[PDB]
Symmetry: C4
Subunit: 221 residues, 4 copies
């Protein structure tokens, strides 16, 4: 019977039907946002959702027999697998984080549809030639996060009280968001030389970012 | 008589006259801004405006006889047509949006003048090789807008109470405007892990923008 | 005697002496910033300044005889000329704007020193192949400035009350500075669809900027 | 005995041991951040730290005998030397800046590990072909800092009262952070034409940054 199901799974109908459900489930997910819609067509949509996930677990099961070991060596299938399993976890229990991560299954639209695969693939293939710079950056943040924590955390707990708060804050400074009016001007009211820490930080982190972007421009070319 | 008008329309004088009215109408539109100017030369300018639009409907009518089917297959002509038709709708009725969309006819300066067409054309031709990325991005926002709405909308209605509000807020975050001091620091006062949602969002959305620009740099070359 | 002065003007000493005064005057200008320095060495520096400008008017006069018509066809000489004339206007009278524009003479360091000329020249030569885009942008701003003025100026005078205030505000939105928390969120409290005006504005203006930068990247390459 | 130590120092074990201590010290530096961890394992970590720095002074001393004059002509060795010497200065005395600059020794991970050297080297080699532009920029800030100080410092001391304050504020404006809502809108309430100073400043400074990046894009290619 292997070939009988294999010709189902491999068919255009099968794929088109799945893509059809993605778009349908996607639309219905946005409708579940409205409190109004849910007081009317609430149960309609709730049952519709348990229907789709069933059709998708079957689909994933059918796909696995047809592909066996090849399935679990396909990034796109693994994604499909993990995103459907997330969606499988019971409505209650633990936390509702899982209930929300369910919406991630709309990314199956990238999986099921080629051309989307193409862009995602292109975007991703750029990432390996970045990891050395990313690593450098992460070491850099880690070193300045520790300095900021022990230089400013006592008198500025919310922003630098903790290694994590300092990472967060340093990230924010990197995006240049309120770095002066909101963080460094207030800091200087106690520590007039705080600028000797953040200006060089901003220069480096910006300089790197420019280089990182240049990398992708030159390397893709 | 066809050719008699065709030599009018196709002439150098004709175009130069029209461009002359654009610049004249454009200048007059900026003066209609001054409350002072309107209490003096109010009626002067109001009559001048109904005159020009008449001259432009004639022009569009003349252009259509001379070009017929070719006219409505010319992007620039269509623009000219639609931007003049907007301007034709009566002074009152419905809303005053139409009175304002009238000023869009100054983009007729781009139509009437070559060299302008060229740059607009150059800018636009870049857009097809972007739609896959734009599509990816739009799906991306939609998935995160839905997550944010159901994760933050209850306790943060202004920013995430509604799918549209979440789209808006997520857009703002993408521009990096006040994303931390204005949105994510407040959110974390209730949801200490909100940062697990917005930092990866900012990374992805930034990464893409960088790639999108790299695309245009490499692809234009 | 022409050649006698021409060999003075053309000498290394002459140029080196002038550059020496630039750096000296530049340093002294920063010292004139200190209220403390001026209560001590105030008169020392004040006389020193009238000395230098004299040496520079002579220099410009000497240079003109040696170059005649060629002088006033040299951008760098013209700059040198106009920046020294600004500096010549009496200490009082009219406004003190002139007293401040004097510091612009430190840009003579770019003039007098080659290599600086080289970078400035390189930076400038890029500008012609931008003017079509700049023109487009300026028309664009002008059209949206007028729309914003008549859509938001009544209820938001500070930001859109006037064509100029609208230009200013639209510029600010373009830099993405507080565009949402500071301008468009407040606007939406009265005009819930204000977002239909500013989001498309931001997209266009950003898109253009990206293209403009791409232009310089591809064209220099 | 020279060669006896040279085979120690030059060995694979030796380097691997040192990198092992870097990562160990780095990890331990991040734990010294926790107030909790220090009341427990406080002395454990404090002793561990004086141990490592000893091991590193030995290492630097061993490396110097093996390399002599070549050592102090190696950028990476010099860094190693200076970053370890910082770490040597006694726990108290003067200020605690030295205690903090100690954490800079984690950049030893860049020294000790190849591939890291490569990226740092790649990033740095880009800097020479920038110094002309940096120089132009520095002159530029200096001229405008002086203008801003004497135009705005009297009525706006916090932001422009002093040449250094003006440098700081002008830097912030360059990052575009709150330049309008936070600095130029307030300034205009007293000086309605302040915009004639900051808009052209923002244009020039932005233009240059764009060019500077274009330089690195074209020049790296
Ligand atoms: C690598 C990422 C390291 C992540 C990390 O160390 O966690 C630090 C913080 C979370 O710490 P935490 O203190 O628990 O939470 C923030 C403050 N709170 C409790 C009030 C919400 O979470 C953060 O905000 C850190 C994430 C920003 C730093 C991301 C790494 C930047 C370096 C490389 C990025 C640019 C390279 C292209
Ligand atoms: C890799 C480059 C970036 C690394 C640069 C790190 C430099 C850190 C700058 C210090 C910023 C503020 C730190 C600070 O503690 O505040 C200023 C202190 C004065 O306060 P402090 O003495 O700490 O005691 C606090 C008492 N209170 C609350 C009443 C002020 O007094 C000072 O801290 C003065 C600091 C001036 C010397 C710093 C210049 C050294 C640059 C590093 C050179 C080697 C690496 C490149
Ligand atoms: C490639 C094309 C790009 C065009 C470049 C755009 C440059 C436009 C600069 C206009 C900026 C002036 C705005 C301003 O100063 O405040 C707004 C004022 C309102 O002041 P207000 O006190 O209410 O009354 C003015 C009194 N009056 C009429 C006797 C002068 O109201 C006015 O000033 C109205 C002045 C409007 C003149 C605009 C002329 C631009 C030519 C347009 C060329 C293309 C047309 C399609
Ligand atoms: C700042 C942007 C404002 C836009 C001004 C609005 C006026 C433009 C209306 C439509 C213009 C169509 C431009 C265009 O490239 O046509 C699309 C393609 C290429 O045309 P092509 O045949 O190359 O001439 O076929
Ligand atoms: C390349 C980069 C491209 C990025 C692609 C994503 C761009 C999305 C831009 C978001 C635009 C936006 O602000 O959405 C607002 C609309 C209106 O929803 P609405 O709740 O009516 O208005 C929100 C503001 N309010 C409540 C105070 C009036 O909310 C909606 O209706 C959502 C539909 C907009 C999606 C358009 C995407 C094409
Ligand atoms: C898997 C791909 C599927 C793509 C299909 C997406 C098409 C639209 C989805 C359905 C959204 C329905 C609109 C909606 O939920 O209204 C929410 C609020 C009004 O709620 P409310 O009146 O407060 O009810 C109580 O009103 C709003 O917040 C504004 C309405 C939101 C605009 C809809 C956003 C469409 C984005 C386009 C995504 C394209 C992906 C390729
Ligand atoms: C590679 C990226 C790494 C992250 C991927 C997923 C990792 C999942 C970690 C999540 C674990 C912690 C999240 C969590 O506990 O939920 C926190 C809240 C839900 O409310 P909750 O904190 O339980 O209620 C406290 C407030 N109260 C008591 C006053 C009601 O809701 C929140 O704000 C959580 C923040 C959202 C993050 C949860 C995952 C969404 C991220 C999906 C996209 C990530 C990149 C693609
Ligand atoms: C072309 C520039 C046109 C300049 C112009 O129209 O003047 C408008 C305003 C000054 O008007 P004004 O209302 O007198 O002053 C601002 C408000 N106030 C009185 C409270 C200080 O001054 C401005 O802020 C306008 C300058 C920003 C617009 C600059 C032009 C942007 C389009 C092209 C830039 C990007 C192309 C690469
Ligand atoms: C290529 C290298 C890049 C390295 C990647 C950097 C990622 C580091 C993530 C650290 C973020 C965690 C920060 C955080 O959660 O809050 C700060 C806490 C303070 O909390 P606290 O309540 O005060 O006490 C902690 C209790 N304890 C010790 C028993 C666990 O204090 C701590 O959590 C201290 C934890 C520090 C562990 C850091 C390990 C990073 C390895 C460094 C590798 C390179 C070394 C040269
Ligand atoms: C995020 C940046 C942090 C920097 C970490 C600090 C450690 C680096 C210290 C000095 C590194 C010298 C790097 C360098 O490229 O040497 C300068 C040139 C090229 O060396 P090369 O001979 O190519 O090897 O001769
Ligand atoms: C490529 C792009 C490169 C851009 C070149 C321009 C970068 C200039 C960055 C400005 C850095 C800066 O914040 O200057 C501050 C210093 C300290 O002056 P100071 O008045 O002591 O400190 C100001 C803050 N306060 C009063 C609250 C303590 O003020 C000064 O001492 C000015 C000397 C800094 C010039 C360094 C330029 C190299
Ligand atoms: C034509 C090229 C000439 C380049 C030479 C520039 C060298 C430095 C110029 C002299 C600046 C003297 C420092 C100064 O004025 O102190 C001002 C305030 C303290 O004033 P204060 O104590 O309040 O007196 C009352 O304290 C401060 O605000 C901090 C001190 C300002 C740092 C000096 C900025 C140097 C920038 C480097 C420019 C390089 C151009 C290639
Ligand atoms: C191509 C760029 C075009 C601009 C180039 C130069 C054009 C010169 C136009 C200046 C004419 C108007 C300036 C002016 O009136 O001075 C305004 C104030 C001085 O105080 P003032 O307004 O007289 O006092 C009123 C306040 N009160 C009564 C309470 C004391 O001080 C100010 O805030 C004026 C704002 C500074 C602009 C003056 C020129 C400096 C720009 C130099 C760099 C421009 C680009 C390189
Ligand atoms: Na301030
Ligand atoms: Na703050
Ligand atoms: Na805060
Ligand atoms: Na807020
Ligand atoms: Na808000
Ligand atoms: Na506001
Ligand atoms: Na305001
Ligand atoms: Na302020």
């Amino acid at each position: 019977m292997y070939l009988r199901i294999t010709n189902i799974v491999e068919s255009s109908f099968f794929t088109k039907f799945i893509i059809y459900l993605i778009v349908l489930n996607g639309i219905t997910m946005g409708l579940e946002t409205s409190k109004t819609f849910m007081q009317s067509f609430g149960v309609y949509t709730t049952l519709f959702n348990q229907i789709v996930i069933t059709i998708f677990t079957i689909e994933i099961i059918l796909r696995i027999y047809v592909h066996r070991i090849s399935f679990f060596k396909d990034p796109w299938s693994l994604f499909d697998f993990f995103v459907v399993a997330i969606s499988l976890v019971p409505t209650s229990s633990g936390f509702e984080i899982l209930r929300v991560l369910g919406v991630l299954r709309l990314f199956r639209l990238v999986t099921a549809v080629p051309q989307m695969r193409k862009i995602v693939s292109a975007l991703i293939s750029v990432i390996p030639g970045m990891l050395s710079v990313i690593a450098l950056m992460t070491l850099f943040f880690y070193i300045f996060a520790i300095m900021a924590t022990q230089l400013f955390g006592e008198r500025f707990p919310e922003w630098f009280g903790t290694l994590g708060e300092s990472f967060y804050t340093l990230f924010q400074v990197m995006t240049l968001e309120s770095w002066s009016m909101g963080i460094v001007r207030p800091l200087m009211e106690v520590y007039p030389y705080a600028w000797v820490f953040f200006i060089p930080f901003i220069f480096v982190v910006t300089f790197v970012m420019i280089n990182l972007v240049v990398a992708i421009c030159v390397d893709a070319m």
